[PDB]
Enzyme design. Structure first.
Site, PDB file in Angstrom:
ATOM      1  N   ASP A  42      -0.301  -7.611   1.321  1.00 57.50           N
ATOM      2  CA  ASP A  42       0.331  -6.303   1.411  1.00 57.50           C
ATOM      3  C   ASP A  42       1.834  -6.457   1.654  1.00 57.50           C
ATOM      4  OD1 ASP A  42       0.680  -3.552   1.599  1.00 57.50           O
ATOM      5  OD2 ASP A  42      -0.003  -3.451   3.680  1.00 57.50           O
ATOM      6  N   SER A  80       4.228   1.324   8.367  1.00 56.66           N
ATOM      7  CA  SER A  80       4.041   0.301   7.342  1.00 56.66           C
ATOM      8  C   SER A  80       5.338   0.016   6.581  1.00 56.66           C
ATOM      9  CB  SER A  80       2.966   0.732   6.343  1.00 56.66           C
ATOM     10  OG  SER A  80       1.741   0.979   6.997  1.00 56.66           O
ATOM     11  N   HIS A 118       0.804  -1.217   0.000  1.00 51.32           N
ATOM     12  CA  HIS A 118       0.000   0.000   0.000  1.00 51.32           C
ATOM     13  C   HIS A 118       0.841   1.272   0.000  1.00 51.32           C
ATOM     14  CE1 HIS A 118       0.469  -0.263   4.473  1.00 51.32           C
ATOM     15  NE2 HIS A 118       0.343   1.052   4.424  1.00 51.32           N
TER      16      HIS A 118
END
Lengths: 226, 4, 226, 4
Positions: A89, A182, A45
């Site tokens: 992801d 992330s 992402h």
């Protein structure tokens, strides 16, 4: 990183700070780690129009000799990545040039397909994200301990799957990862076992991490042919 | 949830 | 290290300098490398009554803030170590407490049963040994390039076995390891492939290194149970 | 052959 501590300067030379220009043309940032001189691992992402990789830094606001800023030559988001469900992801970034494995910069070994981590183990999350919900992204690299929970602790996340993901963070504590973390690695005994993926908006743990071992075959193929 |  | 060069200060943060009190109560030294925050790998013949490890040092006679001196709480000499024939000369050392990761202290990934490097490959030996037959142990960490040779090149060594040991060092050169280098790592591409084991008193290469990949299973077992 |  929430409830963490500042890392010792250049003690984790594989950490990468990523500056992204999203597809929507928005400016954003993520964490990541170097697994080979010209390959950085991170979250899917965090893909975008362009991406810059900063290695050898501790405080992203203080330029140092160890700094190595590299452009990303190619993005390898997992072919099955699903933005709505936030599944698969994980992404591999091939750098324009090979990073120099000198002081401040090194690689991080990743987990084997059958060398995954069992619930109960305490690992460390590392990133440049926010130190809290309304706090800014930390200038310095941070790290915090987080326990691997049984997949049942994540049933409140309708799209969670124990096979490709990990449920991390005792819910009674504040320790956790957040916006900006992330792509950062989840380490257990110096080996990357997961990748920070998503969290609850109010920062209440646990959080979901991509289980690296599950994608070992796919990762190997990319590194093999590139 | 929110992807970090 | 004979005929090599000084390493860049802190460029190989896993290097360990071991001070030993031999079973016969003599004082000695060896090299080694940190493979886990609380585990050092070295040669079995470096065992003794007590041992201490020094990490984060470049010049052993110059104290720095990156210095970490830890005591060894448990010696893990290979089960079949053969003192007289010098076979299975490998050892794991458990430190009383885990080392702290810093810019001057990190771990070294080791070879796996296969990745073993093929003959002809030029690797690097790292240690704090004597710089020459009649020269003192080097104060600063030394590095030297050496090639893997066909096991026949070591025929003059009565008990050399190609499976558990490596024959390293062009005999036509002075480049070699020596007294004090035992336990030091032999790195190929940044991966530890061997451990300096024994040499000729006259320092004529090649020298014998323990093939790490051959003991991976034993290494893994000890790490899992300690 | 001398162990270092």
């Amino acid at each position: 990183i929430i409830g963490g501590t500042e890392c010792r300067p250049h003690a984790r030379p594989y950490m990468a700070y990523l500056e992204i220009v999203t597809p929507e043309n928005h400016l954003s940032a993520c964490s990541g780690f170097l697994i080979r001189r010209n390959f950085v691992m991170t979250a899917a992402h965090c893909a975008g129009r362009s991406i810059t990789v900063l290695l050898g830094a501790h405080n992203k606001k203080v330029k140092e000799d160890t700094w190595q800023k590299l452009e990303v030559e190619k993005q390898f988001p997992h072919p099955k990545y699903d933005d709505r469900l936030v599944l698969n992801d994980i992404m591999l970034l091939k750098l324009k040039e090979k990073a120099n494995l000198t002081l401040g910069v090194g690689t991080l070994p990743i987990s084997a397909k059958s060398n995954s981590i069992p619930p109960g183990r305490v690992c460390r999350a590392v990133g440049w994200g926010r130190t809290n919900v309304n706090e800014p992204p930390s200038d310095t690299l941070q790290e915090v301990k987080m326990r691997i929970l049984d997949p049942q602790a994540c049933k409140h996340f309708e799209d969670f799957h124990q096979e490709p993901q990990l449920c991390v963070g005792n819910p009674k504590k504040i320790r956790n990862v957040y916006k900006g973390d992330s792509g950062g690695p989840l380490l257990c005994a110096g080996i990357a076992q997961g990748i920070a993926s998503y969290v609850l908006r109010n920062a209440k743990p646990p959080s979901v991490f991509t289980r690296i071992s599950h994608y070992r075959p796919w990762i190997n193929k990319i590194l093999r042919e590139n | 949830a929110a992807p970090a």
